[PDB]
Design a protein around this ligand. Sequence first.
Ligand SMILES: CC(=O)N[C@@H]1[C@@H](O)[C@H](O[C@@H]2O[C@H](CO)[C@H](O)[C@H](O)[C@H]2O[C@@H]2O[C@@H](C)[C@@H](O)[C@@H](O)[C@@H]2O)[C@@H](CO)O[C@H]1O
Length: 586
Amino acid sequence: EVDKRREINNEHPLLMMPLYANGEEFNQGKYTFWGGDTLTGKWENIPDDLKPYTVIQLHPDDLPKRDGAARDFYEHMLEEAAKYVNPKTGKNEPIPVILTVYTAGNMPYHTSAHWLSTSWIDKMYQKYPNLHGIFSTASYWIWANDIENKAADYLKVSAKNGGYFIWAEQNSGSAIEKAFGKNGKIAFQKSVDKYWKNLIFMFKNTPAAEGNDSTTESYMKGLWLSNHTYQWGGLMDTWKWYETGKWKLFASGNIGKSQGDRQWLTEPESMLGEEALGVYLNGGVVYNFEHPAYTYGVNNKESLLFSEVIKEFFRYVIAHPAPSKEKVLEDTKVFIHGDYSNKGNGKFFVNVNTDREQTPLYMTGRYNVIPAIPGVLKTDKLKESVSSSRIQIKEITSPEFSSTQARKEYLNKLYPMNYEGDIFAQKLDNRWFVYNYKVNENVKQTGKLKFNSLEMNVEFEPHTYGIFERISNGLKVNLNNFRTNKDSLWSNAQDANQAKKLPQLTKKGAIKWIEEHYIKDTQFGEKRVTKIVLRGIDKLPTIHSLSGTNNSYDQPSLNFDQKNHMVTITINSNGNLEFELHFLEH
Ligand SMILES: CC(=O)N[C@@H]1[C@@H](O)[C@H](O[C@@H]2O[C@H](CO)[C@H](O)[C@H](O)[C@H]2O[C@@H]2O[C@@H](C)[C@@H](O)[C@@H](O)[C@@H]2O)[C@@H](CO)O[C@H]1O
């Protein structure tokens, strides 16, 4: 094994920072990115505490579909990355880069990435120490003849160079199962047997109408735990709102896939945090997002989604490393072996831990994410683990998994009920993670959580998550309900029929919308109420280190009832929020 070019794990997580090549401007002789970011500009803007954990992911987007175009663009940007000089110190500090080398089956009619050979990739790895890895993304919808053979070569060349091969894929049409050899294409399976320590596998939650979120994430987790991948994560995509046909927030009716560029702007900001929690809480450590202009920003500026949600979330997972593989292994009670493709795909988990077929969220943390691997693989490396002896490894074909009811009945024996209320909650050490799991329905949710004898009741509007940590002198609270008002995008439409018929915003229009109405002149949403009730408190708690999104919250309101040893905390807010309550138990 060659020395890894970087570490990627719970203590060293990774945020991919996508930059998408502007092919129209390339045709005009210019080297630029859609949304106006520049390689150097964007890197400099990345907060210094985040720099060791972020990598620039170049994507060839709509570069010309002919030989040389992607090589020429990529070489230009690699040169820029390599030669970067930190203006503060004057020293040459090469920017870490990942290249997107495979997408849309690398079809010559889909992507300029077709004309990027393994030999050229090897050459770049040897020429650029700052090239940390290569990226394959979204071929589930065009599963090319030799995709497995090519993935084997990408993993091998990455290992040869100590770089990572990162593959982001969703289990549509059995994609994850096929990747590991289900249909007899086994080159990647054999590659993985040798080179798994250089592989990252990620979900890509884009094609949301097919409902493969829970199953893909279960695979990513299980592949990791069973040593088929070095780490895992997810690419969370605001385009899910388009794929599922949604429009104005909470509005009734479905418009199908008809207003793409309005639709990818509409997902509530805080909901990206709710999706990301499913990665973190289950030991994942790699994060990436689309649409880049909404989730990250434009013109080397951070969008509010990035500044108020993703940045703050990512800082949290650095400060509190995800559960290690050893830890997750110890907590795992059930591990599924087999193909979700013949057990209803996403339907497998509906009314088990998801509330509907098309969602990226969970309705309970009781089982967290049940890990799994495709039937084609073996559980050998799993069983060889010291931490895996208390795990039940079960075939997906077992009678215990044959219906919704049998699953719940089986899982409930092994995963005890550990909170009350129709709301998402999962516990890790001294921390309760809570979120309202409604996607597009304006319904409050409530839960009752305990820290031993201390009772905490919460009431959350949709698109709200919290992290409640029992500390020695009280309770640390992180809250996020940041949701701006996107109604202006759906102006002039009073119903689904009129919305479907709006003029297209277009790619360029949506980028301009961001510049003119999101980066500035933002239509912030209304402040909204969160309630926390603590029972078993001695005296009126005190509040410390209160901060959050500028102008986004009223002072929290504490109402202590001596007789009943309890406090009611009312928060009115829209953004990220943080404070500590100090108190003693009664
Ligand atoms: C030929 C064709 O139309 N292919 C579609 C893909 O391009 C789509 O992928 C992503 O989908 C969203 C809409 O949900 C949007 O069109 C994105 O541009 C697209 O993502 C880009 O293209 C991919 C091929 C990847 O290279 C990705 O990194 C890019 O950002 C899928 C959605 O499931 O539908 C196909 O039909």
